[PDB]
Amino acid sequence: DKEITVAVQLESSKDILEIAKKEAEKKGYKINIMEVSDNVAYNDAVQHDEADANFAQHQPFMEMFNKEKKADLVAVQPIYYFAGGFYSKEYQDAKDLPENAKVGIPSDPTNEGRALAILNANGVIKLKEGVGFNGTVADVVENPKNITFESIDLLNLAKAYDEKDIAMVFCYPAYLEPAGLTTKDAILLEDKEASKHYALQVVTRKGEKDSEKIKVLKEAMTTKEVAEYIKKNSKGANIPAF
Amino acid sequence: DKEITVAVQLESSKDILEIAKKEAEKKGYKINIMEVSDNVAYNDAVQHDEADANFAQHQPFMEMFNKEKKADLVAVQPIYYFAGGFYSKEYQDAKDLPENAKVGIPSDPTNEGRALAILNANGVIKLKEGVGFNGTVADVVENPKNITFESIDLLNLAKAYDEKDIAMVFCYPAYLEPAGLTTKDAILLEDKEASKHYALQVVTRKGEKDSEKIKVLKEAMTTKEVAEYIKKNSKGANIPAF
Numbered sequence A, B: 001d002k003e004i005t006v007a008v009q010l011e012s013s014k015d016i017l018e019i020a021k022k023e024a025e026k027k028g029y030k031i032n033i034m035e036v037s038d039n040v041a042y043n044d045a046v047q048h049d050e051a052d053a054n055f056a057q058h059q060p061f062m063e064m065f066n067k068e069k070k071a072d073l074v075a076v077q078p079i080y081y082f083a084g085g086f087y088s089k090e091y092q093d094a095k096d097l098p099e100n101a102k103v104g105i106p107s108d109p110t111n112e113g114r115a116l117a118i119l120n121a122n123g124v125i126k127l128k129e130g131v132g133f134n135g136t137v138a139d140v141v142e143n144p145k146n147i148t149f150e151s152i153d154l155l156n157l158a159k160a161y162d163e164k165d166i167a168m169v170f171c172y173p174a175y176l177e178p179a180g181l182t183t184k185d186a187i188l189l190e191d192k193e194a195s196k197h198y199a200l201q202v203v204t205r206k207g208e209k210d211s212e213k214i215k216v217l218k219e220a221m222t223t224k225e226v227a228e229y230i231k232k233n234s235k236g237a238n239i240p241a242f
């Protein structure tokens, strides 16, 4: 078989895969792009051999699926990353935050940990020893300003920037446009090594990781043409991980 | 203070609370309805004293929030319940399912357990001893037909009914309309005691559960007028739990 079914969720992932599909066809392979509209479907597909791979998540998100489903997905190639950050409409820096400030963070566990790791790295709070990227609010062990962490859906974080009683909010570069911002406006920015931890990955089953199909897929997704697209199409926000 | 802030997500919950708001006003209380658009916000609000109560979830869903946040929410009054069920476009009953059938179940843990409990109760599969309503696919210990469980977003379950390679799918009565069905068409229907386990509840903080505000709220949400609305507005699908 010379067909490679890759499941994706975002239009951006589909568009990246369309570039790869051009290249793979020159090597005798047909990439079929399976489009899905929720964050489980692309993993279900690969788990059940309904897709050969997916391009939709970072490794930490994948590992949550494996643990829940006792599945065997592996990340085989990082493609791009971006910088999480905190944004404050009224304050210049994190030292200025008011006592009992409310701070907006993502409501889902993976992104909560990502946001809290940035605060921990910057001394805003201290997390319990060793929790790393898996911290939750309950792991806060020092909170000098008595910050209240407001758990906010990813989709509502940009709006929370303008909310009067929210001192600062976590956001991703994709969501900064309507609010009039870039990562240049961030008062705390995720360091590059942490962003690479969350790079979007090509994912497949463990047993398939060395197959010819996956080799062709990796090779077609890591060319100059893909790197240039990633940068251009994201307006500089997504950084190629190769 | 004579104001009661109740957070809700669904328009149906808001409409039920508007009836209650009429009654509470006659007892000297003003109910403020806080509308939210995701499944965390209503719990965050009550956790942080931003709302006095919420009306949006069942107790099992609430208990997941408590465990994650080390929070202290309690369910104080069930309001209505409905029957989960399985629906099959091509088969009359569950004994007829083909070998290696694909069966659609909800992709989120709480609803996965609810769906699997129905299969377990009806002998379609057997779950590991004692998992009750918290089963996952990994807890299946007997699977005579070698069913593959397709993990499908709640919003996509009704469509999966018409999917050629899906033998049967779990669905809720709210989602049956476009597909042309009622619970009468169910080939397996959740028993009443299990549906009551998942009754939508009035929820508050433990420390507030005996307060005058919560007493007035419970009383205003459990009248004849509310029961009739629940039944009429749902076209018979929601059954009052009082």
Ligand code: NA
Binding pocket: A163, A165, A166
């Ligand atoms: Na607020």
Ligand code: NA
Binding pocket: B163, B165, B166
């Ligand atoms: Na299918």
Ligand SMILES: [Zn+2]
Binding pocket: A011, A012, A015
């Ligand atoms: Zn496009």
Ligand SMILES: [Zn+2]
Binding pocket: A023, A026
């Ligand atoms: Zn080439």
Ligand SMILES: [Zn+2]
Binding pocket: A149, A150, A151, B044, B045, B048, B050
């Ligand atoms: Zn809050």
Ligand SMILES: [Zn+2]
Binding pocket: A196, A197
């Ligand atoms: Zn790492």
Ligand SMILES: [Zn+2]
Binding pocket: A241, A242
């Ligand atoms: Zn490189």
Ligand SMILES: [Zn+2]
Binding pocket: B011, B012, B015
């Ligand atoms: Zn209405």
Ligand SMILES: [Zn+2]
Binding pocket: B023, B026
């Ligand atoms: Zn009365």
Ligand SMILES: [Zn+2]
Binding pocket: A044, A045, A048, A050, B149, B150, B151
């Ligand atoms: Zn599947």
Ligand SMILES: [Zn+2]
Binding pocket: B196, B197
């Ligand atoms: Zn029960």
Ligand SMILES: [Zn+2]
Binding pocket: B241, B242
């Ligand atoms: Zn009664």
